[PDB]
Write a protein that binds this DNA or RNA. Structure first.
Ligand SMILES: [Fe+3]
Ligand SMILES: [Fe+3]
Length: 911
DNA sequence: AAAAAAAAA
């Protein structure tokens, strides 16, 4: 039966014309063939073809065939009738009432039509292929279950008339894709990756410009030759689609370590070790763990290892995962200049974007941009509009972003196959591994498991990391590589980690090689004085600390001779108070005071951070800008601050964090450009702690952020040391390990029990969130996107919402400032009162993250933005916090949600 | 009671 072109696949946006289902099908086939050849990493074609146990050319054709069958389910009365169409010649299959999606039809039809071409009826291959294609809008469905011997009919495909056309179309794409034979073998995780591929094919050839063009040259009839021609014409056009979307591979030539960093004069201990010992080890897929301090150039080490693992696996793509948006912003810049220098300066990639992947990237004026428009004229690595979209970010050839963007691949959620696919062709590098908590850790573990089975190499960077965590992460990777999980009797892969140190895991044979194994000698780092740690008891007034006496004593030498010092507090109110205390004291004269926590407007925090890393940081010490200054802060000090302080005062915290904090003490001493006042004899950490009145007691505010047992364990650990200073990095790992491993450090058995149960809560909630282990998804993709009864989180806990303070006078008119000069925008200044990106930028610059709590259940009408803001994705979910201002001009504490709020210019948000 | 992230075809 010659096929009927009357059946459509697209209408909308086409100016009254419709695009025939055959044509869209072949476009998709052609798009997949091109993607397979010009987009996929060489080593991913190799992994995919191995699963299917056939050659790359056959694999590709199979895949092109499948992709051209994705919308076969549209060929039904239920879909076709949505527009005007003459179906007089096709009686039967009357509307069932089911309202069943075209992608579900596809998966319901294919299992029972595919055998007519060679596929095994009831076969594993047949089932997966159908299920995968049914998942093409991001949701997988169950295998079709049926009770009769006529499954086609049982599922609604009962018209012989409609059935010939469904078969004509099946044979048409089969013919155009070279009639490939069915593969012998196919498996879940492979199929899930191919699905992402079929999705990217649908998306690319669905762009209105592409469709409006193809509409000029539709085939004349449904003849084989007209259809062969359409396919070929579409083949011709797909590479321009890759160039326009920014998707071309970025390949970097092999080089030595010094060739790759020519402005690096002295290669480091770490660096010399890795570059010397790893190339022999990197023979194929595998994991490298590197644990080392700051200032040891782990960054340059990782780039080099990534290129090694890259070449070995035929994976030129990169994804670098960062703990924060700020650090991802920094690294994206770093990675860009590296790529500029490294790629052949003659042949710049002008149609290959290096993407930045996080939720605040759109509002980045550097990154965000301001069709075949300007093809081959963009700046190399520049962000493309296409790659701004949706869940496309991980399809960029190189990308840097939050670890969260990688974790979303293994969460039960729509289009997680897309992110799996985008990751599958890359080398993935996760930085700051020691910073992922138990919940994130179970997610990182399922990710590692899935990368392992997909042959993607992984570099894990960490500061000092507990051996149990290191073990978990390498065990998961290995579990994926080898196709089965660990036994209770099987010996652990990592029983000790050293700091500094590194480790390599071969996916194939499962062998773990430590650095100590290949050189007995320890790796040399920057020599530093041992860190002095001193416990100072602090009096307690009304369950809180009276830091008064102690702050006076320890800071007095600073008031005389100068120097930089930092006071770290466990909560915001505590930091807010301490700043008030030193505010009043310093009023009696010299020296500078600063305050940083999370509760400042975005612009003001970027401001405070900048003048702070400026004064205390490397560039300030090198510019002679370092003052002759006291920082008050919360755990913001823990991430991403270039600071060098002469003294640090911290509340008690888990040693891991207390050691991380103390990384600021004399951070840049080796560079003898730095003047330390006389009283600064040693690098020293003063740990504050309540004076007790038999297992240590701590303020409730502290035990709300850290587990009491953990505090107790750390206190005991440090007391036991009797004033002895900490050799860095010599005693570091020991302390990290023992604070958990040593049970005599926990005298309060009830609290230690509550701590382990809390961690059990975290791991278990994560275990519910993630997709199945690759071995559980072998013959069935359905649990990848299955959930019932809300979006699943990449981080544990209640989360935050951004708030926007506005101000009211006694009318009351509403203003954005306390002066009441800048009016509150009901509308934004764009044509037709619509908000621009610039509007959203200047607005989001004033917002503040607030921790979720009871207050959010008690909001009213005047806490919600106007009708107009409901339009903008960026402004929609904001919460307004009113601030009364008197006619005299004073700003008053103002009720919202059952408490009072006050935005102070020096202390930020108070409640 | 910290910090941290987070419309497609
Ligand atoms: Fe579709
Ligand atoms: Fe489609």
């Amino acid at each position: 039966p010659p096929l009927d072109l009357r059946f459509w696949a697209k209408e909308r946006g086409l100016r009254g014309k419709t695009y025939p289902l055959v044509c869209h099908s072949l476009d998709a086939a052609a798009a997949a063939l091109v993607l397979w050849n010009e987009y996929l990493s060489p080593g991913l074609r190799d992994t995919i073809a191995s699963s299917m146990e056939t050659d790359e050319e056959h694999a590709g054709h199979c895949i092109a065939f499948w992709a051209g069958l994705h919308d076969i389910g549209k060929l039904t009365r239920e879909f076709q009738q949505q527009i005007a169409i003459d179906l007089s010649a096709y009686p039967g299959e009357e509307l069932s009432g089911e309202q069943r999606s075209h992608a579900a039809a596809t998966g319901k039809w294919l299992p029972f039509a595919l055998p007519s071409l060679g596929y095994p009826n009831g076969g594993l291959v047949t089932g997966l292929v159908a299920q995968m294609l049914g998942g093409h809008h991001g949701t997988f469905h169950p295998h079709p279950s049926f009770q009769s011997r006529n499954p086609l009919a049982e599922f609604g495909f009962s018209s012989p008339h409609w059935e010939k056309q469904r078969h004509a179309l099946l044979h048409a794409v089969f013919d155009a894709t070279g009639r490939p034979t069915p593969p012998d073998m196919l498996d879940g995780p492979t199929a899930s990756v191919v699905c992402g591929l079929v999705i990217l094919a649908d998306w690319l050839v669905s762009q209105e410009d592409f469709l409006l063009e193809r509409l000029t040259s539709l085939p004349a009839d449904g003849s084989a030759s007209a259809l062969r021609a359409h396919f070929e014409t579409s083949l011709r056009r797909i590479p321009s689609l890759l160039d326009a979307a920014g998707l071309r591979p970025i390949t970097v030539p092999p080089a030595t370590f010094t060739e790759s960093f020519p402005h690096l004069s002295k290669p480091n201990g770490l660096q010399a070790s890795l570059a010397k010992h790893l190339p022999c080890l990197c023979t194929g897929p595998g994991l490298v763990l590197i644990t080392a301090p700051m200032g040891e150039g782990k960054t340059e080490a990782a780039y080099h290892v990534a290129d090694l693992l890259g070449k070995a696996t035929g994976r030129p793509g990169r994804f670098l995962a960062l703990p924060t948006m700020a650090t991802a912003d920094q690294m994206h810049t770093r990675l860009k200049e590296y790529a500029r220098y490294r790629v052949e300066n003659t042949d710049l990639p002008r149609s290959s974007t290096l993407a930045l992947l996080h939720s605040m990237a759109w509002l980045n004026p550097d990154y965000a941009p301001a069709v075949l428009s300007n093809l081959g004229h963009r700046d190399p690595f520049a962000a493309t509009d296409w790659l701004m979209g949706r869940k496309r970010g991980l399809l960029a050839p190189w990308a840097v972003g939050t670890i969260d963007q990688a974790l979303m691949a293994v969460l039960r959620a729509k289009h997680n196959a897309l992110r799996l696919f985008g990751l599958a062709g890359k080398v993935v590098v996760v930085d700051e591994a020691h910073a992922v908590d138990p919940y994130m850790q179970v997610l990182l573990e399922q990710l590692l498991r899935w990368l392992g089975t997909l042959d993607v190499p992984v570099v894990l960077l960490s500061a000092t990391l507990h051996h149990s965590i290191a073990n978990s992460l390498v065990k998961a990777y290995l579990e994926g590589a080898r196709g089965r999980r660990w036994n209770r009797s099987e010996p652990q892969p990592v029983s000790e980690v050293s700091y500094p140190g590194w480790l390599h895991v071969d996916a194939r044979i499962g062998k773990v090689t430590r650095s100590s194994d290949v050189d007995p000698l320890p790796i040399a780092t920057t020599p530093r004085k041992p860190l002095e740690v001193r416990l100072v008891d602090v009096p307690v007034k009304e369950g809180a600390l009276n830091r008064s006496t102690v702050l006076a004593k320890e800071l007095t030498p600073l008031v005389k001779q100068g120097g930089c010092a930092a006071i770290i507090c466990t909560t915001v109110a505590e930091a807010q108070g301490v700043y008030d205390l030193l505010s009043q004291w310093f009023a009696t004269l010299a020296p500078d005071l600063y305050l940083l926590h999370s509760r400042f407007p975005n612009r003001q925090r970027t401001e405070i951070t900048a003048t702070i890393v400026d004064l205390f940081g490397k560039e300030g010490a090198q510019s002679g800008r370092r003052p002759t200054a006291v920082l008050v802060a919360t755990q913001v000090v823990e991430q991403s601050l270039d600071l060098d302080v002469d003294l640090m005062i911290s509340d008690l915290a888990p040693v891991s964090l207390l050691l991380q904090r103390a990384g600021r003490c004399w951070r840049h001493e080796h560079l003898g450009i730095i003047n330390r006042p006389q009283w600064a004899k040693q690098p020293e950490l003063v740990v504050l702690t309540p004076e007790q009145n038999r297992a240590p007691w701590f303020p409730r505010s502290w035990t709300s952020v850290y587990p009491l047992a953990l505090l107790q364990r750390t206190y005991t650990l440090l007391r036991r040391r009797n004033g002895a200073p900490v050799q860095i990095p010599e005693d570091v790992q020991q302390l990290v390990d023992d604070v958990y491993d040593d049970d005599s450090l926990a005298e309060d058995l009830e609290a230690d029990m509550e701590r382990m149960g809390e961690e059990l809560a975290q791991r278990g909630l994560a275990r519910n969130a993630v997709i199945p282990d690759p071995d559980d998804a072998e013959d069935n993709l359905n649990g990848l996107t299955e959930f019932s009864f809300h979006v699943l989180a990449t981080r544990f806990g209640a989360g935050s919402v951004r708030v926007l303070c506005y101000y009211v006078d006694t009318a009351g008119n509403r203003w954005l400032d306390p002066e009441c000069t800048v009016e509150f925008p009901e509308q934004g200044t764009g044509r037709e009162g619509r908000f621009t990106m610039a509007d959203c930028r200047d607005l989001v610059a004033r917002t503040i993250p607030v921790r979720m709590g009871p207050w959010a259940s008690q909001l009213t009408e005047d806490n919600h933005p106007p009708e107009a803001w409901r339009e903008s994705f960026y402004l929609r979910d904001l919460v307004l916090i009113p601030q009364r201002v008197t006619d005299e001009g004073a700003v008053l504490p103002t009720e919202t949600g059952g408490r009072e709020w006050l935005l102070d210019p020096c202390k930020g948000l108070i409640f």
